[PDB]
Every structure is written in C-alpha cells, then in structure tokens.
C-alpha cells in the first residue's frame, strides 16, 4: 500500500528554520523523482522544488531559491526539505509528492500534507463569544486564536444540519478569527439547547459556549 507520511511542519518564526520529512512506502523509493508542492490557504498549487532519482541534481522555484534545500536518502525511503530563512509568505500546506514516471516530475501520489505556519504570533486559544438569536439564526464567534486549526461542533456533534463554520481569516494582529453559525426553529429557542464546542489542540484549550437569546 502506497504511503507518503510527512512530519516536521508546524509553527516557526520569520528567520526560523524547519526540516520537512516524508517517509515513503509501497513502492521502490530510489526509482522515482520527488518534489515538494505547497498551497497557501485559499490559494492554488505552487511548485517548490524537485529532485532527481539520485541526489545529483536539484531545481528550485524563484520563491525559495537560496533559502530551501531539497534532498533524499534512498536507504531510509525519506524525502527532506530544508527550509531556512522562512518568511510569512512561506506559510502553506507543503506536500511531499512522487513523480508518476521516471522522466517526469508530474505528481501522482501526494503526501497527507502538513501545515507550516510562519509567524511571530504566539500560540493562543480562542475567545469564544455567543452570537445570540419561523427560523432564527445563532452561532459562535471564534476570535483571536493561533495557530490554525480549530474544530467546531454543536451539541457535541449531535447537531450538524444547518451549521456553517466559516474559513478562518488572518487579522492584522496576526491572530485568526472565524464564526460558526446554525439556523434553527424560533419556537424551539427556549427549550432546545445550543452549545458550540470549540477545540484548539495547539493551545490545549477546549471551550463550550451555550448560546441563548438576549
């Protein structure tokens, strides 16, 4: 079974460094060219770097040339991406990728992807505020957290229908904000309970806010 397992991502400050590692299984590693591709949030695919079957040759995008080093150890079935002098715009999900043929770097198999966040902000749990309400609307404001991601569920997952959780937005403070909303019967408002469950693993915080009318 083919697997491209990544690690080494995560938080890092501008100027800081990281080494992404991708350990491959399910195919002869040495027989293939490898590449890294990243995807900034809400944006598209961008090639970072490629490496031949051996270790002899490498190629870099203009964006990372001189700052990044791609490399592989065939004996460990492992792909490396040395990322030095990191900038905020390097923030992306970086994908470990395998070339489909021996003469092309076109990717067929992609790693699970790891988020790399380059920022000066410190890890912070979100402040969660209620958005008080035949249909009324209500939700939770998930404000000022870092880094991504947070998970939001309603009534411990018992309520899924009608729920909208918006993609996060980077604020000028360097912190993220989003809202999760749901539409419900107006008649049920004082009887049914509505609780948003906000989990933010990086800060080891979990918050449950009950959302009732004013």
């Amino acid at each position: 079974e083919v697997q491209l397992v990544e690690s080494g991502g995560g938080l890092v400050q501008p100027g800081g460094s990281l080494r992404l590692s991708c350990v491959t299984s399910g195919f002869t590693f040495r027989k293939f060219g490898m590449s890294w591709v990243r995807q900034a949030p809400g944006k598209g695919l961008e090639w970072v770097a490629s490496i031949v079957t051996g270790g002899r040759k490498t190629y870099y995008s203009d964006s990372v040339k001189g700052r990044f080093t791609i490399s592989r150890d065939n004996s460990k079935n492992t792909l490396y991406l040395q990322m030095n002098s990191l900038r905020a715009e390097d923030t992306a999900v970086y994908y470990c990728t395998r070339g489909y043929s021996s003469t092309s770097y076109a990717m067929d198999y992609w790693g699970q992807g790891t988020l790399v966040t380059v920022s000066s902000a410190s890890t912070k749990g979100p402040s969660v505020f209620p958005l008080a309400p035949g249909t009324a609307a209500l939700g939770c404001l998930v404000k000022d957290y870092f880094p991504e991601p947070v998970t939001v569920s309603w009534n411990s997952g018992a309520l899924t229908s009608g729920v909208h959780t918006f993609p996060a937005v980077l604020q000028s403070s360097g912190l993220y904000s989003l809202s999760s909303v749901v539409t419900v019967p107006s008649s049920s408002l004082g009887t049914q309970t509505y609780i948003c469950n906000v989990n933010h693993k990086p800060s080891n915080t979990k918050v449950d806010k009950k959302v009732e009318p004013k």
Binding site: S35, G44, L45, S104, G113, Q171, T183
Partner: protein, 211 residues
C-alpha cells in the same frame, strides 16, 4: 515564459452536463500537460498526465485534448462528485508551473440570502473590543455586497468577510461580514446597520439594531 492561464475561473454547471476547461500556455511544452482535481481538505488528485493520458482508476467521462499551447480538459457528463477545483500543470521544463485553477460549481435556481445582524456580546464588550457580525445565509449565486453604516455613516476598511464552500446539501453559499470597533467607539454610536446587495433581492436589504 511558461505561464499557464486557466479558463474560465468558475464553471457553473448542472449534474449531467458537459464541462470544458481551458488551459493556455505561453510556450510549446511538448504536450507535457497534466490535470489535477482537488476537493476541500484533500490532496490534489491526478486525472490526466503527459500526452493526454487517462490515469488508471479515473472514469471515462474525463478526457484531455489539445496541442502546442492550447489544451482542454473535458468532463463529458458531470456527476455530483465532479464539482471541485481543477488545476493544470506543465512538466516540460523548470520551473514547473501550475495553472491558477478552475472551480466547477453547481448551477441552481437563484436564492436570496437571509440576513441577520449580531451585536457584540456583553461578554466581548468586557474585553475591550467590539465585533458586529452580519450574516448572509444560504444564497445563490455567490456574488454579494455588504456595506456597514454606523449612525447612517458608511464604514470602509474596517470590516472583514468570509465565505463558505458551496453547500453539499443545497448548493448555496453563506457569507459573514465582521465590523471591528473598540469598546469605546461602539458606545459612542447609536445605530449599527449592514446593507446587502444580491441578485435575489429586488432591493437592498438592511438589518439594524440599537440598544
């Protein structure tokens, strides 16, 4: 050199219809064009490789054509699973370059948004900041305009918007517009209102509150 231009930016189609996607290259690339599909929260999925070759495991409705600088991806009959974002990629020479992507969305009947307004919580005000949330729920098409008016005075550059992916159940979009004021500023003003403009609205809809 070696720029890939995808077209159109968004394909609005219904299930069963035929999809035609365009990708234009600034230079000949020896037919080394590749096509990828990506669904939210997933790695991209290779559909077609160099020489217009159908990848194993990919349905026959997918096909790739073109030559020189002109290349096309054709989905003969759209399925609900096929609505996603599609990227093209050239593999003729470094730097390897991707197209900017085409989103193939579901075309449905126009639906106006339900508009809601949310004052800052008594909780949040205690923290020193005030956020006013405008909610535009379950609408189509995607285009919508939001303007904030505080005591009838138009606000600019102090709001932030977010839009959900197209709903899987009803193929609608929702949008949030958040006005950020200081605690002090919030209490130095009386009327807070957001104005919404959309196809399904014969007239701009304004929802407001006082205290």
């Amino acid at each position: 050199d070696i720029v890939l231009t995808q077209s159109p930016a968004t394909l609005s189609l219904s299930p069963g219809e035929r999809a035609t996607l365009s990708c234009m290259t600034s230079t000949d690339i020896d037919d080394d064009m590749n096509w990828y599909q990506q669904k939210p929260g997933q790695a991209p999925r290779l559909l077609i490789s160099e020489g217009n070759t159908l990848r194993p495991g990919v349905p026959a409705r997918f096909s790739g054509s073109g030559s020189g600088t002109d290349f096309t991806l054709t989905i003969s009959s759209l399925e609900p699973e096929d609505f996603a974002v599609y990227y093209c990629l050239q593999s003729f020479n470094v730097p390897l370059t991707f197209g900017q992507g085409t989103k193939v969305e579901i075309k449905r009947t126009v639906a106006a948004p339900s508009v809601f307004i949310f004052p800052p919580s008594d909780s949040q005000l205690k923290s020193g900041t005030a956020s006013v949330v405008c909610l535009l729920n379950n609408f189509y098409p995607r285009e919508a305009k939001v303007q904030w008016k505080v005591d009838n005075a138009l606000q600019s550059g102090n709001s932030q918007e977010s839009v959900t992916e197209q709903d899987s159940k009803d193929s609608t979009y929702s949008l949030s517009s958040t006005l950020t004021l200081s605690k002090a500023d919030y209490e130095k003003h009386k009327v807070y209102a957001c104005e919404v403009t959309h196809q399904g609205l014969s007239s701009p809809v304004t929802k407001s509150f006082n205290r």
